[PDB]
Design a protein around this ligand. Sequence first.
Ligand SMILES: Nc1nc2c(ncn2[C@@H]2O[C@H](COP(=O)(O)OP(=O)(O)O)[C@@H](O)[C@H]2O)c(=O)[nH]1
Ligand code: ALF
Ligand SMILES: [K+]
Ligand SMILES: [Mg+2]
Lengths: 306, 153, 51, 255, 51
Amino acid sequence: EVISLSQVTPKHWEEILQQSLWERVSTHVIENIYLPAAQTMNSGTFNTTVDIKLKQWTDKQLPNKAVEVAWETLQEEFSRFMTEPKGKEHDDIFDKLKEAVKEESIKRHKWNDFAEDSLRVIQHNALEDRSISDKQQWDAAIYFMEEALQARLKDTENAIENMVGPDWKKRWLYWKNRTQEQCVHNETKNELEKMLKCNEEHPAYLASDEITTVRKNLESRGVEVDPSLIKDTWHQVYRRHFLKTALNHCNLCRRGFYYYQRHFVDSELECNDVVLFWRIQRMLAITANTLRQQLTNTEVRRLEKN
Amino acid sequence: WKMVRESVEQQADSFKATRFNLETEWKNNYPRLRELDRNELFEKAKNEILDEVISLSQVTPKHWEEILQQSLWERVSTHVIENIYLPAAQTMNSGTFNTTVDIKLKQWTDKQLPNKAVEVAWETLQEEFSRFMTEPKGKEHDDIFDKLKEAVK
Amino acid sequence: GFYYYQRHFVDSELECNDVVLFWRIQRMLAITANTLRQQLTNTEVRRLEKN
Amino acid sequence: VLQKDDKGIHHRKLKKSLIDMYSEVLDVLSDYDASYNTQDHLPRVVVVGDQSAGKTSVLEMIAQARIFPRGSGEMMTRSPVKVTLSEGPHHVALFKDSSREFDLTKEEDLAALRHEIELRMRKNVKEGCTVSPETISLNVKGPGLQRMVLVDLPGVINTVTSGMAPDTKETIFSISKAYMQNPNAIILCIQDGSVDAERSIVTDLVSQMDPHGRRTIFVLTKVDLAEKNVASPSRIQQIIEGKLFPMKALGYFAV
Amino acid sequence: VKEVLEDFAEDGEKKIKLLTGKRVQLAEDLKKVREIQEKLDAFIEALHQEK
Ligand SMILES: Nc1nc2c(ncn2[C@@H]2O[C@H](COP(=O)(O)OP(=O)(O)O)[C@@H](O)[C@H]2O)c(=O)[nH]1
Ligand code: ALF
Ligand SMILES: [K+]
Ligand SMILES: [Mg+2]
């Protein structure tokens, strides 16, 4: 079976390693790199800000998480090859030894200690080369970026619905009502939504005067709100506002450029987020290949030897 | 000394012109700018850093626990689904399903889960700390403190 | 077309690079001319007047 | 009151109140302004010339103490060395920021001054070259001294040999022009007297920076070679009279 | 954080490099010009006292 594990095609390793690793770091870039960089209208600063973070992030975290994913990814398939039943036919009599052998073999499975150094150079070069001259590169990058953003949007929206509770559609359909906190959140949300309704470009940071303004606007309706409630409400609603804007930006990025006569119209649609996303997708894809090469050249043999 | 007495005095004209130009740039752009030398800017950045770190230290437990649960779930959801739930699902005996699930969960707890939990806590603390330390997501921020804030972070 | 809009998510037939080059040339020439004018009016013109 | 007396007129207003304070003005301006574009009003006693041995000797003729690096077959003066001169208790000296007082009548302290100067020169000059503009500062007092501030600058080469970095001549000229381009500076050109007047390396520079003869004074080293006829006596007489200078000159003195 | 802030306070070089905001440098230039102006005023007053 472990030899059969050594027969797994690179196609599976590269796809599994790339998909698993990105999902692990998909939110770090969005939350800690992209979104704060999106707070400025200076695209140069936006790209400058992220590149500095990425290189520092790259040196310290990316190759360490990448190897861990590869180390686990190999063990995940190994366990499936090792002890997974052949459908309804399985010799469970051997499972004790199989897992016992695995534990000793994984303890002796010491991943190459210099794999990270190669990845750092690779990742620096993958990030350093930001030239996307190919439409297909653009097309792939934007659709996958949308999925990550749509995931965040639903994650925020699901948190919001709990924060605010069901709407009248479900309150009357399922005979439900709001908690007093949800009632506060709905009105706190409404005031923030009205503020964004006009100030669509409002920065994510709120001034205490806005906090006071919301409170008095809510107190004027009999609703007294602690500032902390507003800030917690603000963060989720802002992302929903921002994320919908980003997806609409993405929609025009693909559609607007897609129309041929619009390519000579220099509108403010610098889809620099697709540049960031694309490089990471390529960067991780190369990372997965380097891991796969190490996986199949050195690490699986060590697993077999152990 | 004759050249001294003849020429040194007029060096005041250029000194005054330089002071005037610097103060003019300040009045036009930096009316709050003072002798903000190596000491004053450092002190202001230090005080802002300490205040923001204290504010972080005062963050409510509710936010902490919510973000920690969300992050750890993001990290472990697919591990659970792919390595425990789905493989266990192959059996029609829910009792052996539950037995295998519990054994795998115990092993994962012993070896991986608390390390991922500590990673989540540490990185979440880093994220909130950076949010306080880094540029606030507004327009009023003065970047002049960013060098010290980031270096200290 | 344009530098950015010709590339992203479009089937452009253009691939224009000369515009960037000569635009940078224009900017470098303008900056050089302004630096030269400043040097002239600060030092060189009054040097010639003194001569 | 003690600061008012010590930092102002401690019974010596001309020599003390504003001679060391002039050096402080120069030091603070050089600290603020690395360039000399703002030092035009501040005169200095500037010694320039070739690698002539008498460059050290003239500076010890004005700073009447054997306090300057002495050597043969080499240009010892790597970097500018500032000396503040004034009257005071006989043969006493100070070295800036060394927290040490020096007795100029004993060989140990003069050697200590020269070695500290050499070490500061060796720290000012980086590998591959012999000169550096970075300054070294002294405060020397004695009855034989005038209220003067002197700077000991590297000799001009105009050519680079012996594996030395080719930038050395341009670095030397920049170091020396930092002062020779000072409208109020006093330039002392040190001329090696072992050669005929036709060989003068620094004449062409002062003839452009001081064509009016308002700063530049030429001094002839090794005057004993005029007695021996090793150097042409006729050209020596003409340089004394000044017939050989393609420029106006402030004066001429024998070393 | 407090220890790091103390270390930066003690570390002159790190403060020098971190504090290059171009306004710190303008303030330093203004202060140094003022100091040289005071030294020059005292020096010139002494010169006039010498006449
Ligand atoms: N014969 C002769 N020897 C001199 C004269 N001036 C200096 N020397 C000697 O040469 C040395 C010159 O000192 P040096 O370090 O070369 O001066 P620097 O090259 O300008 O730094 C002194 O120690 C003297 O012994 C001079 O006019 N005639
Ligand atoms: F020999 Al020199 F300056 F050191 F002329
Ligand atoms: K010499
Ligand atoms: Mg010398």
